[PDB]
Amino acid sequence: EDAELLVTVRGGRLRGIRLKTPGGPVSAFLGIPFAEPPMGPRRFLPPEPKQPWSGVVDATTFQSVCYQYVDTLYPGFEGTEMWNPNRELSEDCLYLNVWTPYPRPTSPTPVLVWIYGGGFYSGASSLDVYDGRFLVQAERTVLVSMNYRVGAFGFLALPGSREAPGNVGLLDQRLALQWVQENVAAFGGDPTSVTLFGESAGAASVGMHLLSPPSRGLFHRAVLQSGAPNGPWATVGMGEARRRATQLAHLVGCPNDTELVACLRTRPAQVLVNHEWHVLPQESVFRFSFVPVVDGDFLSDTPEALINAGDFHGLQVLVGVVKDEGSYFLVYGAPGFSKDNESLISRAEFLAGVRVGVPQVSDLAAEAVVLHYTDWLHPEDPARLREALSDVVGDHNVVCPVAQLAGRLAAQGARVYAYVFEHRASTLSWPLWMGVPHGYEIEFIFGIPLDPSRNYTAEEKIFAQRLMRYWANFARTGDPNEPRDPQWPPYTAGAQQYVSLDLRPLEVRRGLRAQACAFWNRFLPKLLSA
Amino acid sequence: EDAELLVTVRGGRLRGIRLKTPGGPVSAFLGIPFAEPPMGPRRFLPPEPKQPWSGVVDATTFQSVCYQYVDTLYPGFEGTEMWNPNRELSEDCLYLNVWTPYPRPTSPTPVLVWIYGGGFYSGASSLDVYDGRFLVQAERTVLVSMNYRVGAFGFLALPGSREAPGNVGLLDQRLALQWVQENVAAFGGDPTSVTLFGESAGAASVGMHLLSPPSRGLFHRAVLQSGAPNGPWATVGMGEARRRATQLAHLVGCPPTGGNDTELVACLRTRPAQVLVNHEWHVLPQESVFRFSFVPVVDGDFLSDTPEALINAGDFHGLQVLVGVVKDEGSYFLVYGAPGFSKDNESLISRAEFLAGVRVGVPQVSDLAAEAVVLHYTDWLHPEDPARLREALSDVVGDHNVVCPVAQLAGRLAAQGARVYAYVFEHRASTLSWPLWMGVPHGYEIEFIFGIPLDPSRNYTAEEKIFAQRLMRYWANFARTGDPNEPPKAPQWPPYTAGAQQYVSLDLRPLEVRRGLRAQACAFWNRFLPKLLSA
Ligand SMILES: *[C@@H]1O[C@H](CO[C@@H]2O[C@@H](C)[C@@H](O)[C@@H](O)[C@@H]2O)[C@@H](O[C@@H]2O[C@H](CO)[C@@H](O)[C@H](O)[C@H]2NC(C)=O)[C@H](O)[C@H]1NC(C)=O
Ligand SMILES: *[C@@H]1O[C@H](CO[C@@H]2O[C@@H](C)[C@@H](O)[C@@H](O)[C@@H]2O)[C@@H](O[C@@H]2O[C@H](CO)[C@@H](O)[C@H](O)[C@H]2NC(C)=O)[C@H](O)[C@H]1NC(C)=O
């Protein structure tokens, strides 16, 4: 038997599995329980630490995916399916995975912790695109990823109530981070060097852990990919959380918070999922029903406020976006869009599209969006309208919240690095008009192109290797840069420098869509407040 | 006596003068009375037609400049002095001028009627830069210009009252236009072919005549240079006009605030002209530039609704219009009140000075409105670069006051039947004494349109002389045909339309066609900002 694959953690003994990569083997421990199954009376409640077990837990395979909506927009299409659950759905889903070099490191190795995105309504650590084996082999880190509750199960909130306090999916993440502090050394990992990285809702999660003091002692550096806690989709107010929870109860035949939650607890998980999208107040894209709530507890204030008022000396952060953040979302609700045509929309469709991309703002606010995003020498040109609406959704939801986060953090003591990821995968099956869509840098960060059984080019493999080195350098030192030879400069509120990530050497540029983001970050709030 | 210099008009006989020009003789009839003098009891009142006279009136020199403020910002500086009165100030100022070819035209000749600018508070038809001799000689048109009352004398309004109804300066202009209809034939002019042209406040006046039915029958074509009736400086509401009128009276002791209008006006009529003028700038509610105390009032009479409304809801089929702006409409105004500015230095302002300048250049709007202006005119990759800030403030003042109002008028007119032509004037005169940072400032295309560079005593280059001849040709072609284009191989000046938005650059180089009159900027001022002010 293989002693490298036997580990004892606080709760008992584990058996892992040896995995192959083109660079040699790696040790994997998959499906380690970190909480009691949040089932029955535990639905909607904070996670409880997993009670110790006797005998040996089989950690050789991924565990169940937390209950979630399954994307059926284009049935069979690889582009949507690669994000869907690839294991059975269950509420018994609170497991985490550890990948480590082979044989296990016998000295403290820097730890990367992955938090997946999926708008807080979906995602899983078991997805192919999140395979930790290549990063661990190539960069000799320890990699941890956890499942956390999503949708109503993780984020349904009746603020003030004990039966559904909200944010429990965030607590699932915190408990996993505490698990890492207590157990990662048993795998060769160094609990004093833990870097969080996440994408979209995962990035927003990372940011929220930054702004919540009980989490802040569980890690040392942060990476936010295409997401930020201050995104207009990433939190919801107490009032609206209560309304959405109340409408869900109504839609599934339930009626006093105690009674309401008790009736919800009797419903099959799938039933809650089937009505999830229906509690959204207006037609939209890039909006999700059950998200982190600002209730004074996990988040003592809005992330915007907490950001603006924070002291971030001692912090290093890596943040960035893809080239076309908004394009992907247009096919889920914008009139005139399809992955199967050029989506060359009309001015009228563009105008309707704006209310969908920017839901629940006043007509005046919408008018201001149309003003900024119209080229008044070509107001009706379909291609420009397509690009512009992509820009609206992308700037509003991702780029400008990330820019604002980066500016405030840098101006308040943090060292920030910024990137735009500008390579379109040769294997990408979404149409060319989408450019580089949301989510499509991840496979490169994880070194998926190194997988011989996939169709990436030789250059793409080298690129993935560069990216893995940047990310792991950052985890190790707080600085992505290799030894001098073009350098990646820190982002600051003034110079606003970032690099382009693609097949070409690093290129330094200025401004994360500064003109557009001045509108979203500086002007538009003032307008709304009047 | 010389037969060419004798003309009979409806009021009596006139004797003129023979003028020399580089290209041959011109007849000029300068200082023809067209109204009874608005003296004493007639102050603030609509002009009365000049009573007929016996004998011969000598129309041989420019008459008095209408009473007005005299600009003292840079005493002795030619850049400022050239706009100041060059005849004595008098309320007895309602005279016009006719220039005609020598010998007098055998067949009816197209007429150009000039209306000077000057913010409705200043200006005169006697200024050297409005000398009509060259246009008449070069292009064989008849040229008319009139004096009209300005400042309180022309535009103080107590809306409703018969004693100061407002807009009398515009009535001065109309009376002169009626005089052109009744009398221009006697000089060989065609009353069926009359083209109005004006610059700044004169351009805005031209536009108002377009929007006022009793004026509309008096002309056929219009030219608006760097001004529009819909500019935020060009009109004022009834209540604000009354407030300014009342404050003026108060500041000069009338009555011994408000009360009976009849009495308030009667007390105002007893004040010396210069006393009114000395307090004129004091009635402006906030610190500003490009704002003038007494301007046309929207009172439902001369203007039955706002110029914006009238434009938007009008039929302009059968109308030809030529409109345009200079390259740097805003720069001139900054030295009259924007912090940090001077003609004598580079005016490389700080961000703080820029922000303060914004409130001066866009006075009396909400903090939110101002923030919207700062957003659209800040380069957020270079938010504090002094030169960029200087240029930005210039654009703010220029766009808001001139370019965007002109663009809006041009687009609405085109889309509603009018054939429209648009230019941007991009030549900086070799003789310009204002500093280089001002570029091509407000007012400095006029001298070229009038052909002033053909004046031997002046020191323009040969190219500038050639350029002047081109412009005069364009303007006269438009006057004659409603189309500035040469009736060959020469580059064509296409109509301006709401969609293509084509205009030409006018400078030493040949016509270059371009798109959009500050389109991105003007979408802010014309489409969005008004919605923000309603909410
Ligand atoms: C591009 O396609 C959109 C989406 O239409 C769907 O996908 C197409 C490939 C085709 O299979 C359609 O029949 C599908 O409905 C088109 O927008 C739709 O237009 C249809 C009428 O054909 C209308 O009933 C729907 O309301 C529209 N759907 C949306 C999302 O608004 C669009 O016309 C196509 N654009 C082109 C032709 O470039
Ligand atoms: C550029 O000039 C302005 C205007 O100041 C005047 O012109 C100068 C050439 C010089 O002769 C000054 O003394 C004149 O007053 C300057 O702005 C002024 O600054 C002074 C204090 O230094 C202040 O008292 C005035 O109020 C200011 N005037 C205005 C309109 O703000 C400006 O600072 C100069 N820029 C430079 C020198 O970089």
Ligand SMILES: COc1cc2c(cc1OC)C(=O)[C@H](CC1CCN(Cc3ccccc3)CC1)C2
């Ligand atoms: C079912 O109804 C809806 C479903 C969705 C929306 C709106 C809906 O109704 C309004 C959206 O806005 C979502 C669009 C995203 C779906 C997942 N992908 C892939 C991805 C997953 C995880 C990380 C990065 C990329 C990005 C687009 C789904």
Ligand SMILES: COc1cc2c(cc1OC)C(=O)[C@H](CC1CCN(Cc3ccccc3)CC1)C2
């Ligand atoms: C005395 O106080 C003020 C005086 C003025 C302003 C503000 C004032 O106080 C706030 C202005 O904004 C005016 C600035 C113009 C003066 C005349 N010139 C030349 C010109 C004349 C006629 C036509 C075209 C150009 C352009 C700038 C004057």
Ligand SMILES: *[C@@H]1O[C@H](CO)[C@@H](O)[C@H](O)[C@H]1NC(C)=O
């Ligand atoms: C204002 O005073 C005059 C002068 O006596 C008078 O004729 C007029 O009727 C008065 N108006 C009013 C309404 O008091």
